[PDB]
From a paper:
Endolysins are bacteriophage lytic enzymes that can hydrolyze cell wall peptidoglycan, causing lysis and bacterial cell death. The LysECD7 is predicted to be a zinc-binding metallopeptidase with L-alanyl-D-glutamate endopeptidase activity (cd14845) cleaving the peptidoglycan (PG) stem peptide. LysECD7 reveals a wide spectrum of activity against Gram-negative bacterial species, but it is not stable enough in PBS and human blood sera.
The active center of the enzyme contains three amino acids coordinating Zn2+ ion (H62, D69 and H117) and two additional charged acids (R41 and D114) bound to the water molecule for Zn2+ coordination, forming a charged groove important for PG binding. LysECD7 also contains the SxHxxGxAxD motif (60–69 aa) in the cleft region conserved for LAS-type enzymes. It forms a protrusion covering the substrate binding pocket of the enzyme and is enriched in lysine residues along the inner surface. Comparison of the solved structures of native and hybrid molecules revealed only a slight difference in two α-helices involving α2 and α5, which together with the β1-β3 sheet form peptidoglycan-binding pocket, resulting in a more closed cleft architecture of LysECD7-SMAP. We could not resolve the SMAP peptide structure, due to its high mobility, thus the LysECD7-SMAP model was used to perform molecular dynamics simulations. During the simulation the ‘core’ LysECD7 part remains stable (residues 1–131), while the structure of SMAP fragment is remarkably variable (residues 132–148), proposing the free interaction with bacterial membranes. Considering that unmodified LysECD7 lacks activity against other Gram-positive bacteria, e.g. S. aureus, we propose the substrate specificity towards A1γ-type peptidoglycan stem peptides specific for Bacillus spp. and most Gram-negative species.
Residue numbers in the entry: 1 to 125
The structure:
């Protein structure tokens, strides 16, 4: 049973929180949560620093988490370890009846990234 540290799911949408907790239960590789909610200021920097594309991002409204694998051999950035987690997120999505999206040959940045879909969980107007 993988136990979670002090992780800021606080303000993350409860549908996604519950998917998180369950994916952990059923994960081959232990993981943590790097970012949950991202401030509009932090977001602004990221656009200008040429990181993120639009001024829009799931992270603003608690509709995204990014994870980091803790895979024993310490091999933190191994593509596969993120797919083992995607699989665990998808399945917790199948239970719980939540449609979860994975970033997904998958770049690190895409592979750490989970969100609740736009249709079901839309941005404020």
């Amino acid at each position: 049973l993988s136990q979670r540290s002090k992780d800021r799911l606080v303000g993350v949408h409860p549908d996604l929180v519950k998917v998180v907790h369950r994916a952990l239960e059923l994960t081959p590789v232990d993981f943590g949560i790097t970012e949950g909610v991202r401030s509009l200021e932090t977001q602004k920097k990221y656009v200008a620093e040429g990181k993120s594309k639009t001024m829009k991002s799931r992270h603003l409204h608690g509709l995204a988490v990014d994870v980091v694998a803790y895979p024993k051999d310490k091999d933190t950035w191994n593509m596969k370890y993120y797919r083992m987690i995607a699989d665990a997120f998808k399945q917790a999505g199948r239970e719980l009846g939540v449609s979860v999206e994975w970033g997904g040959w998958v770049s690190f940045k895409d592979g750490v990234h989970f969100q609740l879909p736009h249709s079901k969980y839309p941005d404020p107007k």
